[PDB]
Enzyme design. Structure first.
Site, PDB file in Angstrom:
ATOM      1  N   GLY A   1       1.084  -1.098   0.071  1.00  0.00           N
ATOM      2  CA  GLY A   1      -0.022  -0.111   0.097  1.00  0.00           C
ATOM      3  C   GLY A   1       0.806   1.154   0.024  1.00  0.00           C
ATOM      4  O   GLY A   1       2.221   1.304   0.156  1.00  0.00           O
ATOM      5  N   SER A   2       0.235   2.199  -0.067  1.00  0.00           N
ATOM      6  CA  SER A   2       1.109   3.621  -0.286  1.00  0.00           C
ATOM      7  C   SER A   2       1.800   3.787   0.806  1.00  0.00           C
ATOM      8  O   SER A   2       2.950   4.470   0.824  1.00  0.00           O
ATOM      9  CB  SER A   2       0.221   4.818  -0.718  1.00  0.00           C
TER      10      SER A   2
ATOM     11  N   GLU B   1       3.707   2.030   2.676  1.00  0.00           N
ATOM     12  CA  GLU B   1       4.670   0.968   2.701  1.00  0.00           C
ATOM     13  C   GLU B   1       5.611   1.251   1.564  1.00  0.00           C
ATOM     14  O   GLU B   1       6.670   0.582   1.495  1.00  0.00           O
ATOM     15  CB  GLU B   1       3.968  -0.564   2.896  1.00  0.00           C
TER      16      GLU B   1
ATOM     17  N   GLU C   1      -5.164  -9.728   2.866  1.00  0.00           N
ATOM     18  CA  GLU C   1      -4.111  -9.896   4.074  1.00  0.00           C
ATOM     19  C   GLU C   1      -4.495 -11.276   4.951  1.00  0.00           C
ATOM     20  O   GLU C   1      -3.427 -11.580   5.497  1.00  0.00           O
ATOM     21  CB  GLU C   1      -4.344  -8.621   4.954  1.00  0.00           C
TER      22      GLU C   1
ATOM     23  N   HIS D   1      -0.800  -3.034   4.814  1.00  0.00           N
ATOM     24  CA  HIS D   1      -1.293  -1.726   4.674  1.00  0.00           C
ATOM     25  C   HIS D   1      -1.987  -1.126   5.819  1.00  0.00           C
ATOM     26  O   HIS D   1      -3.361  -1.456   5.617  1.00  0.00           O
ATOM     27  CB  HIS D   1      -1.692  -1.456   3.129  1.00  0.00           C
TER      28      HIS D   1
ATOM     29  N   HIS E   1     -13.896 -27.975  23.350  1.00  0.00           N
ATOM     30  CA  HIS E   1     -14.418 -27.242  22.593  1.00  0.00           C
ATOM     31  C   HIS E   1     -16.163 -27.312  22.913  1.00  0.00           C
ATOM     32  O   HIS E   1     -16.961 -26.214  23.338  1.00  0.00           O
ATOM     33  CB  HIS E   1     -14.419 -27.526  21.089  1.00  0.00           C
TER      34      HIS E   1
ATOM     35  N   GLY F   1      -9.349 -22.230  15.687  1.00  0.00           N
ATOM     36  CA  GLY F   1     -10.717 -22.458  14.987  1.00  0.00           C
ATOM     37  C   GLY F   1     -11.162 -21.492  13.906  1.00  0.00           C
ATOM     38  O   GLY F   1     -12.208 -21.666  13.607  1.00  0.00           O
TER      39      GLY F   1
HETATM   40  C1  LIG Z   1     -13.878 -17.318  10.367  1.00  0.00           C
HETATM   41  C2  LIG Z   1     -14.665 -18.467  10.737  1.00  0.00           C
HETATM   42  N1  LIG Z   1     -16.115 -18.290  10.381  1.00  0.00           N
HETATM   43  C3  LIG Z   1     -17.195 -19.079  10.841  1.00  0.00           C
HETATM   44  C4  LIG Z   1     -16.810 -20.367  11.322  1.00  0.00           C
HETATM   45  C5  LIG Z   1     -17.540 -21.127  11.915  1.00  0.00           C
HETATM   46  N2  LIG Z   1     -17.561 -22.809  11.467  1.00  0.00           N
HETATM   47  C6  LIG Z   1     -17.966 -22.800   9.922  1.00  0.00           C
HETATM   48  C7  LIG Z   1     -18.586 -21.850   9.127  1.00  0.00           C
HETATM   49  C8  LIG Z   1     -17.986 -24.309   9.746  1.00  0.00           C
HETATM   50  C9  LIG Z   1     -18.271 -25.189   8.688  1.00  0.00           C
HETATM   51  C10 LIG Z   1     -17.106 -25.660   7.887  1.00  0.00           C
HETATM   52  O1  LIG Z   1     -17.576 -26.325   6.740  1.00  0.00           O
HETATM   53  P1  LIG Z   1     -16.500 -27.028   5.741  1.00  0.00           P
HETATM   54  O2  LIG Z   1     -17.204 -27.419   4.548  1.00  0.00           O
HETATM   55  O3  LIG Z   1     -15.374 -26.414   5.505  1.00  0.00           O
HETATM   56  O4  LIG Z   1     -16.261 -28.422   6.701  1.00  0.00           O
HETATM   57  P2  LIG Z   1     -17.287 -29.482   7.114  1.00  0.00           P
HETATM   58  O5  LIG Z   1     -18.283 -29.688   6.224  1.00  0.00           O
HETATM   59  O6  LIG Z   1     -16.629 -30.461   7.382  1.00  0.00           O
HETATM   60  O7  LIG Z   1     -17.983 -29.065   8.447  1.00  0.00           O
HETATM   61  S1  LIG Z   1     -17.003 -25.183  10.942  1.00  0.00           S
HETATM   62  C11 LIG Z   1     -17.003 -23.632  12.163  1.00  0.00           C
HETATM   63  O8  LIG Z   1     -16.365 -23.613  13.100  1.00  0.00           O
HETATM   64  C12 LIG Z   1     -15.201 -20.416  11.819  1.00  0.00           C
HETATM   65  N3  LIG Z   1     -14.826 -21.453  12.602  1.00  0.00           N
HETATM   66  N4  LIG Z   1     -14.536 -19.471  11.351  1.00  0.00           N
HETATM   67  C1  LIG Z   2      -7.006  -3.738   2.277  1.00  0.00           C
HETATM   68  C2  LIG Z   2      -6.102  -3.202   1.408  1.00  0.00           C
HETATM   69  N1  LIG Z   2      -4.894  -3.733   1.081  1.00  0.00           N
HETATM   70  C3  LIG Z   2      -4.112  -2.919   0.223  1.00  0.00           C
HETATM   71  C4  LIG Z   2      -4.179  -1.586  -0.139  1.00  0.00           C
HETATM   72  C5  LIG Z   2      -3.205  -0.705  -0.981  1.00  0.00           C
HETATM   73  N2  LIG Z   2      -3.816  -0.391  -2.150  1.00  0.00           N
HETATM   74  C6  LIG Z   2      -3.635  -1.369  -3.590  1.00  0.00           C
HETATM   75  C7  LIG Z   2      -2.928  -2.716  -3.167  1.00  0.00           C
HETATM   76  C8  LIG Z   2      -3.873  -0.775  -4.621  1.00  0.00           C
HETATM   77  C9  LIG Z   2      -4.026  -1.248  -5.949  1.00  0.00           C
HETATM   78  C10 LIG Z   2      -5.499  -1.374  -6.589  1.00  0.00           C
HETATM   79  O1  LIG Z   2      -5.540  -1.919  -7.488  1.00  0.00           O
HETATM   80  P1  LIG Z   2      -6.536  -2.183  -8.649  1.00  0.00           P
HETATM   81  O2  LIG Z   2      -6.443  -3.108  -9.807  1.00  0.00           O
HETATM   82  O3  LIG Z   2      -7.865  -2.440  -7.903  1.00  0.00           O
HETATM   83  O4  LIG Z   2      -6.764  -0.779  -9.121  1.00  0.00           O
HETATM   84  P2  LIG Z   2      -5.660   0.471  -9.971  1.00  0.00           P
HETATM   85  O5  LIG Z   2      -5.071  -0.454 -10.969  1.00  0.00           O
HETATM   86  O6  LIG Z   2      -6.688   1.316 -10.679  1.00  0.00           O
HETATM   87  O7  LIG Z   2      -5.040   0.838  -8.937  1.00  0.00           O
HETATM   88  S1  LIG Z   2      -4.575   0.964  -4.395  1.00  0.00           S
HETATM   89  C11 LIG Z   2      -4.329   0.918  -2.563  1.00  0.00           C
HETATM   90  O8  LIG Z   2      -4.566   1.970  -1.852  1.00  0.00           O
HETATM   91  C12 LIG Z   2      -5.360  -1.091   0.407  1.00  0.00           C
HETATM   92  N3  LIG Z   2      -6.009   0.252   0.019  1.00  0.00           N
HETATM   93  N4  LIG Z   2      -6.425  -1.793   1.106  1.00  0.00           N
END
Ligand SMILES: Cc1ncc(Cn2c(C)c(CCOP(=O)(O)OP(=O)(O)O)sc2=O)c(N)n1
Ligand SMILES: Cc1ncc(Cn2c(C)c(CCOP(=O)(O)OP(=O)(O)O)sc2=O)c(N)n1
Ligand SMILES: Cc1ncc(Cn2c(C)c(CCOP(=O)(O)OP(=O)(O)O)sc2=O)c(N)n1
Ligand SMILES: [Ca+2]
Ligand SMILES: [Ca+2]
Ligand SMILES: [Ca+2]
Ligand code: NA
Lengths: 525, 525, 525
Positions: A24-25, A27, A46, A69, A280, A400
């Site tokens: 990002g800018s 950095e 990220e 960033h 859990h 988890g």
């Molecule tokens: C970032 C995030 N969002 C939501 C969950 C909740 N979650 C979710 C949404 C699960 C479903 C996983 O589905 P899968 O298809 O990857 O695997 P299984 O079908 O074997 O459960 S297991 C679980 O704890 C989580 N753990 N982490």
């Molecule tokens: C979550 C996140 N990560 C990184 C950035 C840094 N960043 C980044 C990575 C940019 C590139 C955007 O590329 P794009 O292809 O979507 O559009 P342009 O080619 O027109 O710049 S512009 C910018 O501020 C950000 N703003 N937000």
């Protein structure tokens, strides 16, 4: 010297040579004139950047360096940081801040109250008060991440600092050696050893910090001397023991009553390198049955403080495992007998049972394969069916938090170029960090991704059962074509709708020179 | 009544009927027996969940309700929360916590120090001390999100609370009406009006809170009475004025010197509903030139406090814009003359210039289209080339956090089913929240996504120029097939490699009954 | 059992038998039915409560338990907590919270966002999610305060929790033993020992954690074997070495250049149990001169991380000092020669020079006296003039926070009933915690308080000199009658306007059976 030059010198003198980033800018002044001896690994979001760095740090057993960033980039990574906190991953997270002259007005992409943003998921979080302080702040970040208990740290740097003159006294930072490689004093260690030698039916429970410390072989020696069964502590982020060793007894169920029942009749339970315990499901009962006492060795004061039972020793896991393994008597009890092989589940010519998938992976993968698990409803079967002989062979999201295994598998494969990495990921989990696939393609990191596609969030249907919860929305995830997603990010894609195709796809993937995604049609729960 | 029943009653009595979510085990007791009159909108990753809810709240001008899973789910959303903070989006973020009996041991998916996790990006963050307090805590969250200055809030709820008995006195929460619809007292408002009436060359600067308040038409009346040019404050998250009205002068450059130069010769500059100012690039100079004084009306004390110049009034933007528009004299000065049409850029039969894309969108889209911008290097051209006559016609990531526009476009389209939403997103930006596409497919929300594919992070190459930074890694993003990504998530996909194909693709997309992604091959910077 | 009964059982099983407190309504349900085997020590203001507990914990080398009232009582103690943080004092601070049913409405004396209030001055800060969790939370507080590096912790408890039923599984908390008594592994310890044995001109620098660990005698043995001079690290909170031992070289100046100059020509400097370094004045220069390398042994990762030079080992100070003292070779170098006695300063029959006061204290006090210092402009003279042979003989505000020595002297005297405590406190410093005198009177704790009355904030006039600052207000404190203040709180009071009266007053005070305050008229700076 400039702050830029001094900081990269400090990083290389402290063993860091890779930056995992999404730029990002704020950095650009850090990343400009990027040193020839460093490498930059780009990921497209990220959570993916931090996941990759996390897998790399855990497998390499050394700190990984991250550059994000400002607030938005740091915020996108905070779920990934939750896992890193629970796995004690030594991650140095740096984020660019606005130029000091525009912080007050809160110009766009000012990181407001920056040090507070990643709390409570970091060991240390800081923004320096001047440019010349940056190298010292970076030194603090390196050592805070790397000292036991290891963990992620955060440093925010205004972008105008890099071009400023460094303090000439910063050179004293370059070669600092900081050790936390400590063990219990001799007198108390002798007392512990005597308690182990005297136990009539000891058990051993091992957690992820054993594998992080590469203490696995010492724990094998310890278990053999004590003639003791060995379990892996629940919700396991790593595998700390050879899973077909005669002492091995598998992954503990993540429930209070279940664990006290399993430990019943064991007079002394020695836990090494785990929280006590990462339960859990809610499974109320006795923490331990009468007749069982517990002793925990942990690298983390926070773990020792919150254990609801047992004594604890806060020390380095490598140092303690080595000392115990070498000091205990050889018991004259009989060595435990190996667990039997798992049974073959009936499998027709249609959709795959998870058991079949794991049996087939175990049949075809190299003996030094490394697995990642984010297929949450099939974890027990995975642990029963994969023979993992070597350290560093298993990773699972420590807090988890889904979205870990896909990018972490890429970082692990980058860390271990001669060990085939095979990430087994559910169709639901695959989406959280799907864009990480691109990094595997671009850098040709030959991770194999096995998508277990059953169309649903299967584990949540299970937990709904234990809670007895009906009419819950949002549990199904139909309509995702993972081969198209892999194509979208430049990764070779295969489909396995039955066992014949699974075998063919694995053979092709194992032979491939680049990353490969296999979409497997698995049975619905 | 249970806490579950009471809380859903409170939500429906306060106008909330939709839950944007990605579920987890700690949320199952909240989501079970989901009420028939509510709808649940699933997204596959939490940045996407919050982005969708954010677009929905901003377009609907009412709070949106979100349910995430513990620390990892909240953490995955924190970049999205950074945008929501800067756009004053009224978001009620709820996250499930472990059962109270296992919080102390820090069982898996305990949200440790939960209230601190989303800080500093929320107005209010809380976990209740008992189950019976949950409805009151939810009431607090609803009103804190909804009072000026609006913004995101966070509530963590242990999963065992939902089945507990509610306090019977909770019924007093259901119908509470809380107003912040306030304006400057009569005596001081008369003084302000006299200053405006007396100005010899006033200018008006409008920010996103004007569009949030639907104060746009009043600001038109105000500009016409004062015969004053109107600019949009820099880094604009919304469009607060018809862009082809004769007074309109466009988006201000995000630089200190640039803005004081633009305002030179204006004796009174009235800023409404913007920070003063959201600069981006560092462009040092005078905040204002001699002869210019500034008066800011803002709904946010934090904005009034940090302005480096001018007077300020902290009040509701709707109430203030209406009062000023109706109280000022009609100036006898000549009305400003409309800006000329932008020129047509030369375009051959190959890759598209961004100017061509915007001209073509303006030619083909309905007059009530709504645009989103996450094509960061083409923002100036977009603002010059899209005639946006109506309120609610433009959204841009308010904190500069990429990953907003793709999911927000889906929430906006859900909020405004009769207005065609067209999100213009760079190839780099498209990846941050790519999985949001799935929600558009599953619920058939007919957003059009125009991917500007030039293979690079173009804006960062620009900012590298202003900083004069060479040898920067990680700026190119080759090798992404956006049609395959769209197919992967069930969205119809088209490609436009030249103007003929762009026109054909837009015609098809505009006619389509479902979401459509168009990958446009644009010129490299 | 109730939460009340269980919690007091846990406290007594963990060795705690005294509550230092100032009570409030939220604490009445905890303090009711106060157990017969406990004692409560009341102080009249919370800086005094915590100061007393802090002196008691530091002298006893064990945790002290504190009970304060909600936010206001905790807030009044936060300056005292700043000292406790810097001295690694194991303080368990508990504060009563409103009843859970009125926390949401923020009734009077609700502690809002309670866990955040004492941050960043505590190791751990928490409010439990239910009454049954209280004993486990208390267990966590006890162990977090007591594990290396020791420090203050904070627990907020809603007042209605105490009467609730405890969890029967809480009994497993009662007898938990948690150890951090660790030292560097054998292989690396042998390397360190070889470096010490090989040094041609080693120096030793000791900090407060040596005295906290009672590692003083081992450090004597270490210094004698290495034939090495011993300094005390700057801004010393404790005395870690006999001050008339031949190796002793005194307190280091708190300046960067001053310390590198002092260490010049020493090839290896071993620092034990100190930050590197607690500088005060800004004295820029080299952190170390060429030819000097530094090795730090510290119980605190935060200290090891922030040292700007040297290697570090993070381990228990008691265990490390013992191991090093027993493992190093006896050097054949000559033992260092003792520093000469300080000179007698000319003293007329008028106001006392501080040098005279310290010489007279040294002449008259018992050999096992314990001193406290809060006479900031006379610290160097105090260190030169008091022969302190024994451990635990000196305390000074570790964070420089005035208001420590007066209450701490009372806690120290309570901890060491057979060692005469003599607190030497400036007239300015005496006021910060003046009400602590009452506790000495009421409980007849026979501390002697020597007030050095020169009418001014003398040290600030000095620091004004180094900064060259003129026309500074607020430096003089005329018009305080300390004998009247002592009378006000029931403490016998004496005046010493000249040496004859100082000698008479000390003779009376030393003989007295209760606390005594002596107001000494000292020379103005
Ligand atoms: C970032 C995030 N969002 C939501 C969950 C909740 N979650 C979710 C949404 C699960 C479903 C996983 O589905 P899968 O298809 O990857 O695997 P299984 O079908 O074997 O459960 S297991 C679980 O704890 C989580 N753990 N982490
Ligand atoms: C979550 C996140 N990560 C990184 C950035 C840094 N960043 C980044 C990575 C940019 C590139 C955007 O590329 P794009 O292809 O979507 O559009 P342009 O080619 O027109 O710049 S512009 C910018 O501020 C950000 N703003 N937000
Ligand atoms: C709580 C607090 N307030 C203010 C100060 C500042 N301060 C102050 C006010 C000092 C004057 C001490 O005066 P004294 O009479 O106790 O001793 P001297 O005359 O020897 O300086 S030394 C010092 O650092 C402080 N350290 N701590
Ligand atoms: Ca699934
Ligand atoms: Ca681009
Ligand atoms: Ca004084
Ligand atoms: Na935070």
């Amino acid at each position: 010297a400039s702050v830029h030059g001094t900081t990269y010198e400090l990083l290389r003198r402290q063993g860091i040579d890779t930056v995992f980033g999404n730029p990002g800018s704020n950095e650009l002044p850090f990343l400009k004139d990027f040193p020839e001896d460093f490498r930059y690994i780009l990921a497209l979001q990220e959570a993916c950047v931090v996941g990759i760095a996390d897998g790399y740090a855990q497998a390499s057993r050394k700190p990984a360096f991250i550059n994000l960033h400002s607030a938005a980039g740091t915020g996108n990574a905070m779920g990934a940081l939750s896992n890193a906190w629970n796995s004690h991953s030594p991650l140095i997270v740096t984020a660019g801040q606005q130029t000091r002259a525009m912080i007050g007005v809160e110009a766009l992409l000012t990181n407001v109250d920056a040090a507070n943003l990643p709390r409570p998921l970091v060991k240390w979080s800081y923004e320096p008060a001047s440019a010349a302080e940056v190298p010292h702040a970076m030194s603090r970040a390196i050592h805070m991440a790397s000292m036991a208990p290891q963990g992620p740290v955060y440093l925010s740097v205004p972008y105008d600092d890099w071009d400023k003159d460094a303090d000439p006294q910063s050179h004293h930072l370059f070669d600092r050696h900081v050790s936390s490689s400590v063990r219990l004093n001799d007198q108390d260690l002798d007392i512990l050893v005597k308690a182990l030698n005297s136990a009539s039916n000891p058990a051993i429970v091992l957690g992820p910090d054993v594998d992080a410390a590469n203490a696995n072989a010492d724990c094998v020696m310890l278990a053999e001397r004590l003639k003791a069964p060995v379990w892996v502590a629940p919700s396991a982020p790593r595998c700390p023991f050879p899973t077909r060793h005669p002492c091995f007894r598998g992954l503990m169920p993540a429930g209070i009553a279940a664990i006290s029942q399993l430990l019943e009749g064991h007079d002394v339970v020695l836990v090494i390198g785990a929280p006590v315990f990462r339960y859990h499901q809610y499974d109320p009962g006795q923490y331990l049955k009468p007749g069982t006492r517990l002793i925990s060795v942990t690298c983390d004061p926070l773990e020792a403080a919150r254990a609801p039972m047992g004594d604890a020793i806060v020390a380095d896991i490598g140092a303690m495992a080595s000392a115990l393994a070498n000091l205990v008597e050889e018991s004259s009890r009989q060595l435990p007998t190996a667990a039997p092989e798992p049974a073959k589940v009936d499998q027709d010519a249609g959709r795959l049972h998870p058991e079949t998938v794991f049996d087939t992976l175990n049949d075809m993968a190299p003996e030094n394969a490394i697995y990642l698990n984010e297929s949450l409803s099939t974890t027990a079967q995975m642990w029963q069916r994969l023979n993992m002989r070597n350290p560093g062979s298993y990773y699972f999201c420590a807090a988890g938090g889904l979205g870990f295994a896909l990018p972490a598998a890429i970082g692990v494969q980058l860390a271990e170029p001669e060990r085939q990495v095979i990430a087994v990921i559910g169709d639901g989990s695959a989406n959280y960090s799907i864009s990480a696939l691109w990094t595997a393609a671009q850098y040709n990191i030959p991770t194999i991704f096995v998508i277990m596609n059953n169309g649903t969030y299967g584990y949540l249907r299970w937990f709904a059962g234990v809670l007895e919860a009906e009419n819950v929305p949002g549990l199904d995830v139909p309509g995702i074509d993972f081969r198209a997603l892999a194509k979208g990010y430049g990764v070779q894609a295969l489909k396995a709708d039955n066992l014949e195709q699974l075998k063919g796809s694995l053979q092709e993937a194992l032979s491939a020179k680049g990353p490969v995604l296999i979409e497997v049609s698995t049975v619905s729960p």
